[PDB]
């Protein structure tokens, strides 16, 4: 797990999420997709305690898909983010809390605006222009503070993200094996194959 | 691992002549890392204002909870909740979680719609009511707010003066706390107009 | 009407017909008695020998509760066992908490409340037995009789079942002719006689006699069965009195 | 009539009709006999079939090394009650290192059957049982009926036409009771007893079922070619 | 906290300071530690502030319902028994230390209850951080057969010992008097010996001192 | 008509099971009577031992509920003892919970509430009993409070219960018209017992031996029943007057 | 054993009536008359104390009950049912309101809670409806004075004035003639006393009439002094003497 | 605490100091540690004040309920009820209780119940922190069938010494006399007992 | 046991109808008529009070029209007490949705849950069904203005105009006659009252025998307003349409 980022630009939200899965002194996998599509215009990335991460992501995914079928309608990113937060807020006072941090990137079709929500395992929600979980933010937040502009294009966003990954690859102690990058916009969710 | 000082933030409230003020900073961090500069800690249900400092997930949860309870109150009572009454509901609700509490420092401010009296109150995490004529403080810079208020404050300030006083109490308390700051909001509240002002402050 | 189809329903008289119907099952049963004496109590019962094939002595009907109480009953036998099982639980819980063995009046009300409880609801059936019981506590000897309604009183002598009237009449005489008291060894013999006299009302099948007793002097305040030389001595006394 | 709708209802003469109807299922059951000496106790049971293509319903169930029974009536009810006995015998061994007394086995069955005769929703058991065992006081035969009444006997029989065997045993009493130290003669006397209840049918090799327990004999069941010796 | 109770001729008096703390910080300079359980049964509380308020309100509620059910004036021994059994059940985790007092058809009464559920009877009692300062005064000046005015003086003197000598106690003295055959008189801020002196300077700011980025009218209506 | 078997309303708004439970009240064919002195509350009830085989000492319809409260029952003994046991448990629990002795009127109310529930809830039958509670309450003084199968209760100056209750009631009403007061103006409970027995005799038109009666007396801080001999002493004093 | 009655005892008949509610209303019809009148500065509720024996002490039976310091109740129908409802009504005012908000519930909401309890007796398993109609009079800061009727169904209605039980049709007519929106409390007490005489047969004095008001605050009835905002109960039961004083100027 | 109960010719006497302690601070110098669970069955309390009170309150309830149903309970019965509570809740109690009562059949009886909840019937019993210092004294000076005055003296001298050496004990010496005659409360102030 | 007294509330007739549901609808058919009419720019709810008395407090009264949240209301026909149980459930359910998603509950979702609660009482639990039919009038940003009805069966359907309670046959014929799709609220108001005026079993329709509500976008820009009409406001609208 470890590295998950998100940038919201003019017309899309971009999530970048590390590919490594490490247990002990071994990188077991270098092509891991730390993300689940919750609905056609909503994507959630995640990081945290082994097992908990996927179990939580898939549980939320199942719940949103159920909602979609029942209402023949797609929940807004705000609605999904609030559902997710509440689920985590319950979890934190459970016998065994989900130790999962998430970013939710969605395109709200009613408002034609992209939206990025950062939520930690305590159920602490914030909407942001750019976000990160874990040690990632200690490098990227300062860098995005500098280079980010609100009216950027998807392509400007990707270059801004390439800067972030470059910095992390220079200064982070661990080899996170690059990132899978995904774009969420008015046409849904697609994956950038070369990064 | 002290939940009340992970996210950081502050709230202060004051009475004046036929008015009240309630202010908060805008910071939300994860210990040393500042994360959001837009995290407001003051909410309102009708004309009753509630500020909440502490663990941010509980701040959000309690807002959502008191919105829930005040909406039902209004539907059944056919009137908006008053601050004296809301203060009691806050106390009930926190003490209900006596041995697994929400990690918060709520503050209530408002003007009773029948009597016209200004009203403020503060709470510990477990529901104890601290009522006060003058001011209430809360958050990670509460020591600092106490020191500012206790010297700066005087009774019966007019809304435009109270604004300056509360803003200066907040700002200078915030600048001596690493976990408070990053913006500020002040609410000036009179019988039937409420003015919200964002303050310019240092962003470190 | 239909007031008699469901337990716990009051008829217009103020009666519970289901309890009265339970009483008929008791009247249908074999005769059993209790005799109170100087320092104790005696219990006896008629056991119908249905067949040669019943092993004599080995279908015991009188039941001990704790170490100091005897119980006998007429009617539905399993209902009687169910009641004694409860009596045993009640006595154990009393002794567990208060150390002393359960006093007989105290024990009587435990059974009384339990039986009365089975007249309160339509989801249970009243007990199909009348129960004679008692023994020796710190205040002396006590004999009780308990009916399907939960009604119980203390008795000088008591009888129930098919031969209750014969037995009752025989008991009333003993009370009149022995106002200063009856000894335990005497009462054992009288018990045997009265059972034999009461057997007249059930004479198709011949019967086996069973007796027990608690006496402060003869059994040291504990419940024991009467067997061997003492049982035969009391049978003989009873044989001699029908002839 | 108006009072046979459930077990919780007494008739005006003090009868429990559902219990009496349970008793009726026993009368339709195939005949079974039990008898004992002072050294052994024997069960003989006539098994019944559905037709010529079917098996003959097992009527005898082992409960412990020293105890078991024969059934007559609803078989699944015998399965429930036998299973309960198996546990009771088992609890006695594990907790007290003690073989369960046949007399206690009787009292326990009585109290189990009785609870189903006083509560709403339940039903009485629709089966009668003959329990034999050899315990610390020798050989024992018990007759269980689903009213709750349990009775200890030298011999008896239950099921259809059981009156023949029961009379025979009442005559044969002084003979069979003294068949001590002789297994095959006690069985023969039970096989003869059960034959007093046969009609238009006789005892065949896959028709007859016998069981025995005694001093130095574990409870064991004989069927098929192992009972040809007795026809 | 400092709290006390003192019996006199024809009733009982209780008193308390008005300081509330969070560590070394004074949170409330004028908090009310005298709690009404019923009209003529009042309770002084020390310990965890929310606990003393909740436990006093809860038992107060149940006493009211009891009084209505029985058609009788509530007794102190009922409040005592209900409080002690509740606190005992919680093994001290509800940190309420209470001086229970009042008048009822039986007479006048004074008790104390500790958080674990132990109760005491006496003519004079003190609880809280300032209890030793207070008890020193009570042990010095108490006598049998006090008048109402003597008992008030003794009680408020005992609170003052706490106010001055104990850092856990300060500000004001609250008193409540429960005399037989009379309404209880709650004397809020009976003494106020800690009035803040005139400040040297007014810190009222020149209007416009504070830098502002935005304004907006907030809508509180429907 | 299944509305006559359980406690639901009939078309005319009645509860037949409750009404029939009132009729069970008289099954014992005993009359009871209670009066108040200045210092005491006396209750007397007829005692009928038909069978010679009964131990007469075990035949009673008077119960000591607590140290201060006594209860006489009109109705079958099984229901009577059921009510007694509960009332004892309720008075002990009240004392433990609230720190003082349960008053007569509060126990009466509580038993009345229990009875009310049986009139509303179907699975429970009413108890076929009327319960007369007596004490010398520390607040209200001599007290008589009576409960029935309807869940009704009220305080009395004096009262009577049973088949010939009307005769006794009017006898007592007539006395209180004449005396102009709420009680028997008498110092000792001994003479208040004598009054009670006297006026029961006049009303019922029967004489009493020592074994025809059963007497309970409530004073400040104790309720007790009288022995056959205590009653004989009391009968003797009536005759010699 | 245990409650096997988990099914409804009140069910719809083919005509659509709920029998047990109708039959309960019939029990209310048989009940003694009680009434309530709302004035500008107060409410009065009143009823007859029909004694069962003259040996009974009818002061020990209170038909008019305090629920909160500003709310009172009276009834017509089955007294025992009323008594337990008062117990539950008092308790629910605390559990579902005072323990939450630190103040007593307003009249309509307490009434709402009592109605709920009575509706549940109309649908829950193994129970019959309550055989009472309540009149509940009260005051609260934001609604002023109010008067509500509550029936066995659980339905409740606000009234300017009404009556229930035995002589209700007649008494409701009497009240329509005499009621206006300018009545002072004393005028309403007078009308209540007149209306009640028509339905009472025997003696008509302050020992056979039970009558309470919701009026001004009574500081003398509070039991303590020192809290300015606590001014005392608005509920007051009129004494035997106070009633007779008004029966002379009738 | 220092407490004891002593059987004698006419019945039994219970005795106790009056000190309740939280640390070295005396929270109450005039405590009453002799507690009535029935007319003539009393107990001496030592250990946690809360625990021993809660226990005595429960026992009093049980014996009041016992009395209503079965008449007067024996002292053995009272001791058994104490034991049951102390034994079954041994993990959550700090209670060392002495039970003492007067029957007319059994005369005076003393049962002591230490921390484990074991029961021990004895001619006399001593308990509490102060008891350690008077085992020697009490064993040498106790005799059976003492008179009332001799027993009062034995208790007065014994508790005087326990109080002298134990700082946890002190104040007044309370006693309760249980005989056929009734129930008598005695008290003895420092100025008397200190200079014995 | 108790089997004897069980009416078996949740069984089928031989024809495959639910006895209790049918008999509950029969009850409702005698209740004060309630009408819902939906327009392009809002919704109307009108309802007739059950035979009033002159002494009833009409201004502080609520029998027919209840507020569920700010964007949804209902008109009741049947047992008021039954309906209040359901109303408080619906109110709570709305607040759970808001709390969970930070969005006001879509009208259908609220209606479905209430209807699902009613259905349960017809299939399990042995209890009598609620003797209530609702008209739901609400707004959300998916479907705009919506009318629904639910009945004791738990079945719900959506409408342009609908009546429940007494004389729905007569009332439905009249609405079908004069209703047209482009209608405004103010026309709808008139239609609602005219329809009650002709279907009422009373001699003449007056303000004191009515409850009335509108749900308009008639506040300032993009937002919805609920108006529960006060007595004087009904008196005025009754004149303004020429019924008095
Ligand atoms: Mg700062
Ligand atoms: Mg910084
Ligand atoms: Mg019932
Ligand atoms: Mg402890
Ligand atoms: Mg010392």
UniProtKB/Swiss-Prot annotation, chain C:
Entry GO CC? nucleus; proteasome complex; proteasome core complex, alpha-subunit complex; proteasome storage granule
| Key words, A-Z | Acetylation, Cytoplasm, Nucleus, Proteasome
The UniProt PTM text for this protein says: The alpha and beta forms are probably products of the same gene with different post-translational modifications.
Give GO terms: molecular function aspect only.
Answer: mRNA binding
Return one Gene Ontology term, BP aspect. Answer: proteasome-mediated ubiquitin-dependent protein catabolic process
**Compartments reported by the entry:** Cytoplasm; Nucleus
Function description: The proteasome degrades poly-ubiquitinated proteins in the cytoplasm and in the nucleus. It is essential for the regulated turnover of proteins and for the removal of misfolded proteins. The proteasome is a multicatalytic proteinase complex that is characterized by its ability to cleave peptides with Arg, Phe, Tyr, Leu, and Glu adjacent to the leaving group at neutral or slightly basic pH. It has an ATP-dependent proteolytic activity.
Q: What else is known?
A: Present with 12000 molecules/cell in log phase SD medium.
Task: Tell me its family.
Answer: Belongs to the peptidase T1A family.
Q: What is the designated name of this protein?
A: Probable proteasome subunit alpha type-7
Query: Which organism does this sequence originate in?
Result: Saccharomyces cerevisiae (strain ATCC 204508 / S288c)
Gene behind this chain?
PRE10
Report which part of the complete sequence is shown. Answer: 6 to 248 of 288
From Swiss-Prot, chain F:
Q: Does the keyword Acetylation apply?
A: yes
Places the protein is found: Cytoplasm; Nucleus
GO CC list: mitochondrion; nucleus; proteasome complex; proteasome core complex, alpha-subunit complex
**Which GO terms are recorded in the biological process aspect for this UniProt protein?**
proteasomal ubiquitin-independent protein catabolic process; proteasome-mediated ubiquitin-dependent protein catabolic process
According to the UniProt entry, the cross-link of type Glycyl lysine isopeptide (Lys-Gly) (interchain with G-Cter in ubiquitin) is at: 222
Q: Does the keyword Acetylation apply?
A: yes
Principal location class: cytoplasm
Q: Which residues carry this modification: Phosphoserine?
A: 227
What does the UniProt keyword field contain? Acetylation, Cytoplasm, Isopeptide bond, Nucleus, Phosphoprotein, Proteasome, Ubl conjugation
Report quaternary structure and partners. Answer: The 26S proteasome consists of a 20S proteasome core and two 19S regulatory subunits. The 20S proteasome core is composed of 28 subunits that are arranged in four stacked rings, resulting in a barrel-shaped structure. The two end rings are each formed by seven alpha subunits, and the two central rings are each formed by seven beta subunits. The catalytic chamber with the active sites is on the inside of the barrel. Interacts with CIC1.
This chain's function reads:
The proteasome degrades poly-ubiquitinated proteins in the cytoplasm and in the nucleus. It is essential for the regulated turnover of proteins and for the removal of misfolded proteins. The proteasome is a multicatalytic proteinase complex that is characterized by its ability to cleave peptides with Arg, Phe, Tyr, Leu, and Glu adjacent to the leaving group at neutral or slightly basic pH. It has an ATP-dependent proteolytic activity.
From Swiss-Prot, chain G:
Annotated InterPro entries: Ntn_hydrolases_N, Proteasome_alpha, Proteasome_alpha-type, Proteasome_asu_N, Proteasome_sua/b
Q: Which GO terms describe its cellular component?
A: nucleus; proteasome complex; proteasome core complex, alpha-subunit complex; proteasome storage granule
Nucleus recorded as keyword: yes
Q: Which UniProt keywords apply?
A: Cytoplasm, Isopeptide bond, Nucleus, Proteasome, Ubl conjugation
Report where the covalent cross-link Glycyl lysine isopeptide (Lys-Gly) (interchain with G-Cter in ubiquitin) sits: 108
Q: Any signal peptide, and if so, which residues?
A: none
Briefly, what is this protein's role?
Answer: The proteasome degrades poly-ubiquitinated proteins in the cytoplasm and in the nucleus. It is essential for the regulated turnover of proteins and for the removal of misfolded proteins. The proteasome is a multicatalytic proteinase complex that is characterized by its ability to cleave peptides with Arg, Phe, Tyr, Leu, and Glu adjacent to the leaving group at neutral or slightly basic pH. It has an ATP-dependent proteolytic activity.
Q: What interactions and quaternary structure are annotated?
A: The 26S proteasome consists of a 20S proteasome core and two 19S regulatory subunits. The 20S proteasome core is composed of 28 subunits that are arranged in four stacked rings, resulting in a barrel-shaped structure. The two end rings are each formed by seven alpha subunits, and the two central rings are each formed by seven beta subunits. The catalytic chamber with the active sites is on the inside of the barrel.
> What name is this protein filed under?
Proteasome subunit alpha type-2
Q: Which organism is it from?
A: Saccharomyces cerevisiae (strain ATCC 204508 / S288c)
Corresponding gene? PRE8
UniProtKB/Swiss-Prot annotation, chain H:
Cite a single GO MF annotation: threonine-type endopeptidase activity
Question: What is one Gene Ontology biological process annotated in the Swiss-Prot or TrEMBL record?
Answer: proteasome-mediated ubiquitin-dependent protein catabolic process
Where found, per UniProt? Cytoplasm; Nucleus
Q: Name one Pfam family in it.
A: Proteasome
Question: What reactions does this protein catalyze?
Answer: Cleavage of peptide bonds with very broad specificity
Q: Does the keyword Protease apply?
A: yes
UniProt entry tagged with the keyword Hydrolase: yes
Q: In terms of domain of life, where is this protein from?
A: Eukaryota
What's in the GO CC field?
Answer: cytosol; nucleus; proteasome complex; proteasome core complex, beta-subunit complex; proteasome storage granule
**Positions annotated as active site in the UniProt record:** 1
Its EC number(s): 3.4.25.1
Other remarks on record? The side chain of Thr-1 acts as a nucleophile, and the N-terminal amino group acts as a proton acceptor.
- Oligomeric form and interacting partners: The 26S proteasome consists of a 20S proteasome core and two 19S regulatory subunits. The 20S proteasome core is composed of 28 subunits that are arranged in four stacked rings, resulting in a barrel-shaped structure. The two end rings are each formed by seven alpha subunits, and the two central rings are each formed by seven beta subunits. The catalytic chamber with the active sites is on the inside of the barrel.
Q: What is this protein called?
A: Proteasome subunit beta type-1
Q: Which organism is it from?
A: Saccharomyces cerevisiae (strain ATCC 204508 / S288c)
């Amino acid at each position: 797990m470890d590295i998950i980022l998100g940038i919201r630009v003019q017309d899309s939200v971009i999530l970048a999420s590390s590919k490594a899965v490490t247990r002990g002194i071994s990188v077991l996998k270098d092509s891991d997709d730390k993300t689940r599509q919750l609905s056609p215009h909503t994507l959630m990335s995640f990081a945290g305690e082994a097992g908990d991460t996927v179990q939580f992501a898939e549980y939320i995914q199942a719940n949103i898909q159920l909602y979609s079928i029942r209402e023949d309608y797609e929940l807004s990113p705000q609605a999904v983010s609030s559902f997710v937060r509440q689920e985590l807020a319950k979890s934190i006072r459970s016998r065994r809390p989900y130790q999962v941090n998430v970013l939710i990137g969605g395109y709200d079709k009613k408002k034609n605006k992209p939206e990025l929500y950062q939520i930690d395992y305590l159920g602490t929600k914030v909407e942001l222009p750019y976000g990160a979980h874990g040690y990632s933010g200690f490098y990227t937040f300062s860098l995005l503070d500098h280079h980010y502009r609100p009216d950027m294009t998807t392509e400007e966003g990707l270059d801004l993200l390439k800067l972030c990954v470059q910095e992390l690859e220079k200064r982070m102690p661990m080899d996170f094996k690059g990132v899978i990058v995904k774009i969420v916009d008015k046409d849904g969710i697609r994956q950038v194959d070369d990064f | 691992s002290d939940p009340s000082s992970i996210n950081g933030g502050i709230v202060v409230a004051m009475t004046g002549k036929d008015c009240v003020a309630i202010a908060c900073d805008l910071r939300l961090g994860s210990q040393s890392l500042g994360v959001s500069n837009k995290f407001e800690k003051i909410f309102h249900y009708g004309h009753v204002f509630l500020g909440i400092t502490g663990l941010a997930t509980d701040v959000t949860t309690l807002n959502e909870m008191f919105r829930y309870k005040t909406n039902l109150y209004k539907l059944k009572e056919e009137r908006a909740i008053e601050p004296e009454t809301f203060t009691q509901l806050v106390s009930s609700s926190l003490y209900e979680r006596r041995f697994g509490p929400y990690f918060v420092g709520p503050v209530v401010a408002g003007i009773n719609s029948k009597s016209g009296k200004p009203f403020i109150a503060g709470f510990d995490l477990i529901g104890c009511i601290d009522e006060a004529k003058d001011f209430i403080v809360s958050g990670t810079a509460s020591d600092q707010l106490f020191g500012m208020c206790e010297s700066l404050y005087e009774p019966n300030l007019e809304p435009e003066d109270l604004f300056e006083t509360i803003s200066q109490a907040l700002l200078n308390a915030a600048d001596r706390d690493a976990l408070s700051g990053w913006g500020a909001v002040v609410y000036i509240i009179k019988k039937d107009e409420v003015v919200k002002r964002y303050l310019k402050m240092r962003q470190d | 009407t239909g007031y008699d189809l469901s337990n716990s329903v009051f008829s217009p008289d103020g009666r519970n017909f289901q309890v009265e119907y339970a009483v008929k099952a008791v009247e249908n049963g074999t005769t059993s008695i209790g005799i109170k004496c100087n320092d104790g109590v005696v219990f006896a019962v008629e056991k119908l020998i249905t067949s040669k094939l019943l092993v004599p002595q080995k279908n015991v009907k009188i039941q001990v509760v704790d170490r100091h109480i005897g119980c006998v009953y007429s009617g539905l036998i399993p209902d009687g066992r169910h009641l004694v099982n409860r009596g045993r639980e009640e006595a154990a819980s009393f002794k567990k908490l208060y150390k002393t063995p359960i006093p007989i009046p105290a024990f009587a009300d435990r059974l009384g409340q339990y039986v009365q409880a089975h007249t309160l609801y339509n989801s249970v059936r009243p007990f199909g037995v009348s129960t004679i019981f008692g023994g020796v506590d710190k205040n002396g000897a006590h004999l009780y009789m308990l009916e399907p309604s939960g009604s119980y009183w203390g008795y000088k002598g008591a009888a129930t079942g098919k031969g209750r009237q014969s037995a009752k009449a025989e008991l009333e005489k003993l009370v009149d002719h022995h106002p200063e008291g009856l000894s335990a060894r005497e009462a054992v013999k009288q018990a045997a006689k009265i059972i034999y006299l009461a057997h007249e009302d059930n004479k198709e099948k011949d019967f086996e006699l069973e007796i027990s007793w608690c006496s402060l002097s003869e059994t040291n305040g504990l419940h024991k069965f009467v067997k061997g030389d003492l049982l035969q001595e009391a049978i003989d006394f009873a044989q001699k009195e029908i002839n | 009539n108006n009072y046979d709708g459930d077990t919780v209802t007494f008739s005006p003469t003090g009868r429990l009709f559902q219990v009496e109807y349970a008793l009726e299922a026993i009368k339709q059951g195939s005949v079974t006999v039990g008898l004992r000496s002072n050294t052994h106790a024997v069960l003989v049971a006539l098994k019944r079939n559905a037709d010529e293509l079917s098996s003959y319903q097992k009527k005898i169930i082992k409960c412990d090394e020293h105890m078991g029974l024969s059934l007559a009536g609803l078989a699944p009810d015998a399965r429930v009650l036998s299973n309960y006995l198996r546990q009771q015998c088992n609890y006695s061994s594990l907790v007290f290192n003690r073989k369960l007394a046949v007399e206690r086995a009787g009292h326990l069955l009585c109290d189990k059957a009785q609870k189903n005769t006083q509560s709403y929703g339940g039903r009485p058991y629709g089966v009668g049982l003959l329990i034999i065992g050899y315990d610390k006081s020798g050989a024992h035969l018990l007759e269980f009926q689903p009213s709750g009444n349990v009775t200890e006997l030298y011999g008896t029989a239950i099921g259809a036409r059981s009156q023949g065997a029961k009379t025979y045993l009442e005559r044969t009493l002084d003979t069979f009771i003294k068949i001590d130290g002789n297994p095959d003669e006690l069985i023969k006397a039970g096989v003869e007893a059960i034959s007093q209840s046969l009609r238009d049918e006789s005892l065949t090799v896959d028709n007859l079922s016998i069981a025995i327990v005694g001093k130095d004999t574990p409870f064991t069941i004989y069927d098929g070619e192992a009972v040809a010796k007795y026809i | 906290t400092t709290i006390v109770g003192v019996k006199f001729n024809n009733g009982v008096v209780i008193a308390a300071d008005t300081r509330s703390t969070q560590g070394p910080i004074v949170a409330d300079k004028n908090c009310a530690k005298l709690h009404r359980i019923s009209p003529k049964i009042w309770c002084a509380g020390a310990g965890t502030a929310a606990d003393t308020e909740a436990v006093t309100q809860l038992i107060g509620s149940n006493i009211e319902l009891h009084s209505l059910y029985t058609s009788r004036e509530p007794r102190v021994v009922s409040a005592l028994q209900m409080l002690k059994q509740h606190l005992f059940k919680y093994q001290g985790h509800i940190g309420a230390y209470l001086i229970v007092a009042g008048v009822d058809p039986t007479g006048s009464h004074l008790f104390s209850i500790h958080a674990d559920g132990s109760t005491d009877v006496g003519y004079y009692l003190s609880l809280g951080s300032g209890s030793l300062a207070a008890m020193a005064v009570l042990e010095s000046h108490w006598k049998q057969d006090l008048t109402k005015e003597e008992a008030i003086k003794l009680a408020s003197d005992a609170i003052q010992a706490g106010i001055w000598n104990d850092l856990g106690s300060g500000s004001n003295v609250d008193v409540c008097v429960m005399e037989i055959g009379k309404d209880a008189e709650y004397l809020r801020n009976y003494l106020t010996p800690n009035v803040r002196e005139e400040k040297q300077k007014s810190y009222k700011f020149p209007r416009g001192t504070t830098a502002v980025l935005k304004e907006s009218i907030v809508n509180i209506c429907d | 008509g299944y509305d006559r078997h359980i406690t639901i309303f009939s078309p005319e708004g009645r509860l037949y099971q409750v009404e029939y439970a009132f009729k069970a009240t008289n099954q014992t064919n005993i009359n009871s009577l209670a009066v108040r002195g200045k210092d005491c509350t006396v209750v007397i009830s007829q005692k009928k031992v038909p069978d010679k085989l009964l131990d007469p000492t075990t035949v009673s319809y008077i119960f000591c509920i607590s140290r201060t409260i006594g209860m006489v029952v009109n109705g079958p003994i099984p229901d009577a003892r059921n009510a007694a046991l509960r009332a004892k448990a309720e008075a002990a629990e009240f004392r433990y919970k609230y720190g003082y002795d349960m008053p007569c009127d509060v126990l009466a109310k509580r038993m009345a509430n229990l009875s009310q529930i049986y009139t509303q809830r179907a699975y429970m039958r009413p108890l076929g009993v009327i319960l007369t509670f007596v004490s010398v309450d520390e607040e209200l003084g001599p007290s008589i409070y009576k409960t029935d199968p309807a869940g009704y209760y009220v305080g009395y100056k004096a009262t009577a219960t049973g088949p010939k209750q009307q005769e006794i009631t009017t006898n007592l009403e007539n006395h209180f018209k004449k005396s102009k007061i709420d009680h028997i103006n008498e110092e000792s409970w001994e003479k208040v017992v004598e009054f009670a027995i006297t006026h029961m005799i006049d009303a019922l038109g029967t004489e009493f031996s020592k074994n025809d009666l059963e007497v309970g007396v409530a004073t400040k801080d104790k309720f007790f029943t009288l022995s056959a001999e205590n009653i004989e002493e009391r009968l003797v004093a009536i005759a010699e007057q | 054993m245990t409650d096997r009655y988990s099914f409804s005892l009140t069910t719809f008949s083919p005509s659509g009536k709920l029998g047990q509610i109708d039959y309960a209303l019939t029990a209310v019809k048989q009940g003694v008359t009680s009434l309530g009148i709302k004035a500008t500065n107060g409410v009065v509720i009143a009823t007859e104390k029909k004694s069962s024996s003259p040996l009974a002490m009818s002061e020990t039976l209170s038909k008019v009950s305090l629920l909160t310091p500003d709310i009172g109740a009276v009834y017509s129908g089955m007294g025992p049912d009323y008594r337990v409802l008062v117990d539950k009504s008092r308790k629910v005012a605390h559990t579902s309101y005072k323990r939450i908000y630190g103040e007593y519930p307003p009249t309509k909401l307490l009434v709402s809670e009592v109605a709920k309890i009575m509706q549940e007796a109309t649908q829950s398993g193994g129970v019959r409806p309550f055989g009472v109609s309540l009149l509940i009079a009260g005051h609260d800061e934001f609604n002023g004075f109010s008067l509500y009727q509550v029936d066995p169904s659980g339905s409740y209605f606000p009234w300017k004035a009404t009556a229930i039980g035995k002589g209700s049709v007649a008494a409701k007519t009497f009240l329509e003639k005499r009621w206006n929106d300018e009545l002072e409390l004393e005028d309403a007490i007078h009308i209540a006393l007149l209306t009640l005489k028509e339905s009472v047969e025997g003696e008509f004095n302050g020992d056979t009439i039970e009558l309470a008001i919701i009026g001004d605050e009574n500081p003398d009835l509070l039991g303590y002094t020192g809290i300015p905002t606590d001014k005392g109960p608005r509920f007051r039961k009129l004494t035997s003497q106070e009633i007779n004083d008004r029966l002379e100027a009738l | 605490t220092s407490i004891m109960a002593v059987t004698f010719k006419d019945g039994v006497i219970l005795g106790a100091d009056s000190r309740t302690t939280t640390g070295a601070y005396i929270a109450n110098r005039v405590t009453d540690k002799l507690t009535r669970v029935h007319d003539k069955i009393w107990c001496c309390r030592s250990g946690s004040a809360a625990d021993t009170q809660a226990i005595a309150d429960i026992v009093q309830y049980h014996l009041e309920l016992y009395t209503s149903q079965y008449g007067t309970p024996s002292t053995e019965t009272a001791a058994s009820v104490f034991k049951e509570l102390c034994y079954e809740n041994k993990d959550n109690l700090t209670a060392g209780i002495i039970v003492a009562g007067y029957d007319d059949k059994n005369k005076g009886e003393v049962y002591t119940i230490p921390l484990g909840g074991s029961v021990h019937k004895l001619p006399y019993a001593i308990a509490g922190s102060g008891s350690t210092f008077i085992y020697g004294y009490c064993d040498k000076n106790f005799r059976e069938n003492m008179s009332k005055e001799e027993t009062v003296d034995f208790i007065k001298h014994s508790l005087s010494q326990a109080i002298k050496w134990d700082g946890s004990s002190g104040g007044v010496i309370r006693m309760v006399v249980l005989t056929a005659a009734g129930v008598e409360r005695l008290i003895f102030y420092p100025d008397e007992y200190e200079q014995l | 046991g108790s089997r004897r007294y069980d009416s078996r509330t949740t069984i089928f007739s031989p024809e495959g109808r639910l006895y209790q549901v049918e008999y509950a609808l029969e009850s409702i058919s005698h209740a004060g008529t309630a009408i819902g009419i939906m327009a392009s720019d809002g919704i109307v709810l009108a309802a007739e009070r059950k035979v009033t008395s002159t002494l009833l407090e009409q201004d502080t009264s609520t029998e027919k029209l209840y507020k569920l949240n700010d964007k949804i209301a209902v008109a009741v026909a049947g047992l008021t007490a039954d309906a209040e149980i359901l109303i408080n459930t619906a109110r709570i359910h709305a607040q759970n949705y808001l709390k969970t998603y930070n969005e006001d509950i879509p009208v259908e979702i609220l209606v479905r849950r209430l209807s699902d609660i009613k259905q349960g009482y017809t299939q399990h639990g042995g209890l009598r069904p609620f003797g209530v039919s609702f008209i739901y009038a609400g707004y959300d940003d998916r479907y705009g203005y919506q009318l629904y009805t639910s009945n004791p069966s738990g079945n719900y359907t959506g409408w342009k105009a609908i009546s429940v309670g007494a004389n729905t046959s007569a009332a439905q014929t009249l609405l079908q006659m004069d209703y047209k799709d482009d209608m405004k609220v103010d026309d709808a108001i008139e239609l609602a009252l005219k329809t009650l005026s002709k279907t009422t079993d009373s001699s003449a329709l007056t303000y004191d025998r009515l409850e009335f509500a509108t749900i308009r976008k008639g506040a300032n820009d993009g937002e919805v307003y609920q108006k529960i009409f006060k007595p004087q406001e009904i008196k005025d609208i009754l004149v303004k349409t020429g019924i008095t």
